[PDB]
Design a protein around this nucleic acid. Structure first.
Lengths: 283, 116, 124, 124, 124
DNA sequence: ATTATATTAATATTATATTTA
RNA sequence: GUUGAAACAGGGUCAGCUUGCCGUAGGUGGCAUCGCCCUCGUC
């Protein structure tokens, strides 16, 4: 079980593609309506971490939460028929099953999952809780509409000639999604989030943009990862100014940004040397 | 402004039930707490969830009839009010029950849709 | 049951989305997933992100129609609606959020009729 | 329903695309695929790539018209629109992305009228 | 709506093409195919190939005018535009490609006016 | 102390010269 | 002017002392703007 507080400043961008698409809008990434900053949900990073663990582990005591062929009720029923089948008086039986699943599953240990279906077994508050990403420069939507020379269904739209089904494949030119996230210790002591699991989660967050790739998302990479390791379980300084110390703004006289040569990640670790640490894993 | 809103909530719940037969946490059990009071908050998202429920329906003609009847319902409402008064919440409940029993009748919605 | 002179942004936005959905439905009867099954989820909140692609896909949807006069009438009513739409806002207020769906279903009801849209188009 | 003194880049860009589409439609009534069926898909995002070919094809479209005074009026309103367009931007913002289609359909409605464009041209 | 101190190559190139087209139109009202109907198709991409023949035909177009002072004013504004044009480039960038048409229509609007070009020429 | 469960409608807006000492 | 008259709903009372909407989850498998076109006939 970990005992320190970690305030990591995850920074990642996108070369050309659709990163975190659709708040129910067709196929466009989440962007700020009032301004234009791109937004990326934390569930995408969580799924990338899960895929990295699935491809770089394959062992027990670290379940990866299977994909489409994985009914949650079936997994809950399978985890219930272990040490606490019935002889545990429902109440503490749910807590025992939750602890067993935390010791067996890695997704519920790092983040969490819903285990309150049919056979209830409590719920996990979750130690590591990432937030929604947000860029700084107002990104623009390219919308790269592409075609296909093969129809899908046999409906009336399939003409006698070129059976075509076009559509749109949205793309993004740039946008350093300044992600945020905090890690607690009280829930980590209950879920069993040890330091080895924390190191595995850091490695996944660092090297998830090298394997989890597709045609819609294109090419994505992680810039830097500045983890703010604390000293105790108390609160020293508000995390707002702590995350504001690593500001990311524009460089010289430029309108937009295209790569890392147009951003100036101002890192001035001066006032965060009281009772906190600093490490660089991705940058 | 309240009766047609109740009919709207009723047809919304009926479409959601026709979409998912074994429903546990329906849109009712999560939205009716404020639908009877604040319409612009609940219906601002129920109208978003509705086309997905209509697309989920295996019978496209049923979704067509439900869309036509919800059009006929919302036609009487010129604008979603900020809050439903104490009598407006009663009208909401009355219209909800009326529409939810008119839709669960033998051949009522189909006969109404065929007369358009 | 439709107010075309309300001068409300949500009303005209909903009417525009409704006529867009009507055009997409008329383009092909065997349509599985329309725009309302994906575009409407953020049409009343982020209209500047969905209505751009909507206006981009509108001419192709009009050309897909078997009748060219139908597309002309649909564009005419689109512009008659957008007359009161002086600008596409960033985010709609709660009252405007409700007026969006209000105008949407009002315009859908006005369009799915026997003699109404053509009658209004004849007096222009 | 058209603001000609909005001083917005998206407004004038959309109005320019609208008058371009109107000119292409007036060049030949039996037109199958217009510019809106291909050029509008990236007009609000990459205007500097489509509006170049648009301005290249504009004089030929004006010469294709059977009436020469109509082309003069169309060029006059084109320039009255582009007065507020100090430069063609690289990419439009979301607000400008919406204002593009706003001005497009507003100018289309203003053009498809009985006595309006000629009335505005007479006072010049 | 015209910036004469923008110091942009596309702006001055478009203004030069616009005044050239204005001179050709003033040379004869009964003109069928102007330069814009042929020269503008590659004016923003290959200016060094079209503007050479343009400057070659400019003096004959000025001599074709019935008024000699009009040609003097047109040459004066041509040179006032080309002041910022230090050289004719090989190919214009996309931003410059758009600025070409921007300056073209801006100068056309500035020229087709009552009292504007002569007023600017009087203060020289 | 349930019900119910199959498709509305679709044929053309507009269209005649700014300015030139 | 000798025949139903008189009539309190009261003085007056905090409806609360309060309670995390959540624990949380990839718009996806991916799809060629294409198969194509003398700037000409020529003064």
């Amino acid at each position: 079980t970990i005992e320190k507080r970690y305030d990591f400043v995850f920074l990642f961008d996108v070369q050309d593609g659709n990163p975190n698409g659709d708040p129910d809008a067709g196929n466009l990434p989440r962007i700020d309506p009032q301004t234009g900053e791109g937004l990326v949900t934390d569930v995408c990073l969580k799924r990338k971490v899960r895929n990295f663990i699935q491809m770089t582990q394959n062992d027990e005591h670290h379940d990866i939460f299977i994909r489409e062929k994985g009914i949650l009720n079936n997994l809950i029923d399978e985890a219930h028929e272990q040490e606490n089948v019935k002889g545990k008086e429902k109440g503490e039986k749910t807590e025992a099953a939750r602890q067993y699943m935390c010791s067996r599953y890695y997704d519920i240990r790092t983040f969490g999952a819903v285990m309150t279906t049919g056979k209830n077994a409590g719920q996990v508050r979750g130690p590591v809780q990432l937030t929604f990403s947000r860029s700084i420069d107002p990104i623009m939507t390219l919308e790269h509409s592409i075609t296909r020379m093969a129809v899908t269904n046999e409906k009336d739209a399939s003409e006698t000639g070129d059976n075509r089904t076009m559509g749109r494949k949205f793309t993004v030119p740039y946008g350093l999604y300044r992600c945020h996230g905090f890690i607690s210790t009280h829930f980590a002591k209950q879920t069993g989030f040890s330091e080895n699991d924390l190191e595995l989660f850091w490695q996944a967050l660092v090297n998830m943009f090298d394997h989890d790739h597709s045609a819609a998302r294109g090419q994505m990479n992680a810039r830097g990862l500045y983890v703010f390791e604390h000293s105790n379980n108390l609160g020293d300084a508000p995390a707002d100014s702590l995350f504001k110390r690593i500001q990311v703004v524009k460089k010289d006289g430029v309108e937009v940004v295209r790569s890392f040569d147009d951003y100036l990640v101002s890192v001035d670790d001066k006032n965060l040397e009281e009772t906190k640490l600093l490490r660089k894993l991705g940058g | 402004i309240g009766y047609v809103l109740g009919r709207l909530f009723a047809v919304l719940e009926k479409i959601q039930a026709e979409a998912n037969p074994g429903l546990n946490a329906t849109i009712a059990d999560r939205y009716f707490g404020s639908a009877s009071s604040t319409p612009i908050a609940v219906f601002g998202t129920l109208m978003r969830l509705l086309p997905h429920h209509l697309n989920k329906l295996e019978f496209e003609g049923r979704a067509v009839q439900l869309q036509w009847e919800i059009r006929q319902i919302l036609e009487h409402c010129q604008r979603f009010p900020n809050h439903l008064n104490l009598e407006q919440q009663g009208l909401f409940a009355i219209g909800y029950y009326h529409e939810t029993q008119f839709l669960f009748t033998k051949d009522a919605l189909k006969n109404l849709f065929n007369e358009a | 049951g439709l107010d075309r002179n309300r001068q409300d942004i949500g009303y005209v936005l909903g009417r525009l989305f409704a006529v867009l959905e009507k055009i997409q439905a008329e383009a092909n009867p065997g349509l599985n997933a329309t725009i309302a099954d994906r575009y409407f989820g953020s049409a009343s909140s982020t209209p500047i992100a969905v209505f751009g692609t909507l206006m981009r896909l509108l001419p192709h949807h009009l050309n897909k129609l078997e009748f060219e006069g139908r597309a002309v009438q649909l564009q005419w009513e689109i512009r008659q609606i957008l007359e009161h739409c002086q600008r596409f806002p960033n985010h709609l207020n709660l009252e405007q959020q409700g007026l969006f769906a209000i105008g949407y279903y009002h315009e859908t009801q006005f369009l799915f009729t026997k003699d109404a849209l053509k009658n209004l188009f004849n007096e222009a």
